[PDB]
Amino acid sequence: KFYCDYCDTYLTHDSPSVRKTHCSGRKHKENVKDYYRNKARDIINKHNHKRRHIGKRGRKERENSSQNETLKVTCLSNKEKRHIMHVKKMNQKELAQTSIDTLKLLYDGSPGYSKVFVDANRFDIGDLVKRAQTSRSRDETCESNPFPRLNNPKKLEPPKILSQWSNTIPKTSIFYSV
Amino acid sequence: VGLHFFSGEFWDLYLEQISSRCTSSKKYWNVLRKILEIPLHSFSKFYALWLQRIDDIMDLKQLSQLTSKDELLKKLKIDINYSGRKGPYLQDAKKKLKKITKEMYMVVQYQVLEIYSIFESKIYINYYTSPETLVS
């Protein structure tokens, strides 16, 4: 008697494909995805800090630090800090999931494009792609699109900038572009 | 090939390799500091990494990862060995470091935006096609 620990459904004793059928379905394929999302989410959310050993400060150490000044502490309200934490977590997720693919768009008309960037006709990991999109075939030749500039392509996307520093940008561009 | 305008992918590979292999976590700072000054196409991603990674610092001593103790004490007027109440002092150090990063970002943004506006926006072809091709 063996049961899945994710689905919690008790499964009549199996060892062959019956375990390769359960583990390849959907109630055991996405329900094992939600589990490890939560466990990895925790280790991201953990905020417990190291144990604090506070030693008795001496007079020579205290007098200099008392001489200088007192420092104000910035503090927010409950709703404000809730909103700020939500925003910061969302920003961290969005930046972490970001992948730069400028080189893939730049070589869109290369003579050997379909054999490298398509990622389905590659020679290393193509063996996996080789029941379930106008895919780019390997049989493309450079005669197709002899002149790329004939209005086919579009301008490169302008570089992104941080929104919290969006007033830093110069006000007016040097040249007048229509 | 590090100073390429479109060199974001190479630096992403370098940073992920450093973060995956290294455990001392000083080479990460020493490499992101260099990346911060190169006028790349995707400088914003590395500046966001820098801002988040400076925002997650938790104690005074880890500011020594950034620069030297003498440099911090002399230029930014931040004392790492400051003993007492360290909460507000660490917040002050974070504010000063973020101001310095903002000035760096001002310089780099001016450079990158000028380059893109003048030259890089007009170039459409970056690949060798054939001896029979004509370029505009």
């Binding site: 969005e94 570089p159 900038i161 969006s166 006000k171 561009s173 007048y176 | 966001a48």
Partner: peptide, 24 residues
């Protein structure tokens, strides 16, 4: 809300110095 936004700028009003097509 995303932290990356496309840059926007104001035009310099098309005098003879700021015209990119000027050849004279």
């Amino acid at each position: 809300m995303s932290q990356f936004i496309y840059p926007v700028q104001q035009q310099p009003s098309l005098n003879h110095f700021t015209d990119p097509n000027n050849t004279t």
